[PDB]
Amino acid sequence: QVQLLESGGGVVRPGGSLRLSCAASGFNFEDFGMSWVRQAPGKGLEWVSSISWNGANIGYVDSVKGRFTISRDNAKNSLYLQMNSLRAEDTALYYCAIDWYRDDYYKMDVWGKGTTVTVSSASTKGPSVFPLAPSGTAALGCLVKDYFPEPVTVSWNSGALTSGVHTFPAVLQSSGLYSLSSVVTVPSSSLGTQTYICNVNHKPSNTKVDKRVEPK
């Protein structure tokens, strides 16, 4: 369980700034160069910045030169990215990753889960969660409506239920808010004896909702 844990994302106005951090565990952080790689919505992976294990070589993609500053604190096992003068093209999920072992060899096989940076003037709003009630095989789900910004996570029965689950990509409504559904197919016979609860988490607004989905 080598691990990289990014944090610090959120909503920031264009022209503003944010500081991302990445906490490493399970390895000698001081032995590895680190990189930031982002994925803007609807785009591919883009390498952003790298700092070598000893800080001797630092690089930036051209579009962030003079705006972003990468740094590391080996005593805290932490990597940082100070992002200034934020633009719309900076909206993305930001991964940290090891790249090289010292100046010896490229490795780049340890990645974090990403943290989301949203460059917007809009306000943070948490979702409402409504049930999609059931009627051989039955379908039921949760409707997660009117939140900002992306993303929302949905699980079922606290992660015990995974087979048959489909969580749809969010849809930007004309209001400017996002909405999505998560559904699951289950045996009809289990509808009264089994409990079904969807667990919606929207970290940007500290919204945690546990919704029971029962037949009407």
Place this chain on the structure above:
Amino acid sequence: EIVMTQSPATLSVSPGERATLSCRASRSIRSALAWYQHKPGQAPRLLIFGASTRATGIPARFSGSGSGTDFTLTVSSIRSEDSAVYYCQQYDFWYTFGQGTKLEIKRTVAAPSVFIFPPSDEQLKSGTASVVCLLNNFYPREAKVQWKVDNALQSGNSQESVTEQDSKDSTYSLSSTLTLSKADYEKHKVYACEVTHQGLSSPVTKSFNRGE
């Protein structure tokens, strides 16, 4: 800066076959070329480094080669779990990913299982009604959904959403959400969802009556 050009952009391949992905560098990157698999919802996974060396635990059906500016990755004995976007990355002079190749697994035709959900009473308290139509586990991805309210064809008040290809059975699922005001919702009785797909003999309709 070095430009990495991948081809083809998209690729649809049946299980058991092989596909070859191409990567071109605008100038020589020697052998510092890597390949990545990126499944939606997960972190990127390194497949190849040094143009032709498999990373730890990568099976022999991933084969990479190339030198200078021209590279290939060949993925043989393709499985449903291979549905992903594949990127090359040069690491000769800092790092640059290519624009990616999206690989879809071509499976047999599968018809949608259709379900309709009326608005919950809780949501009606807010003054909005969301009617959701679910199309489950179908292939291929192309599907048509028509909303009919009291036999009146709806237009402009619905939004669709399609899942990423399922990694185990290679199907898609689609949701269409009809959004109406509580007042408009309460003026009509029959709410219908009509589904057209290649795997269905004729279009399928699921409906409900408001209140039943």
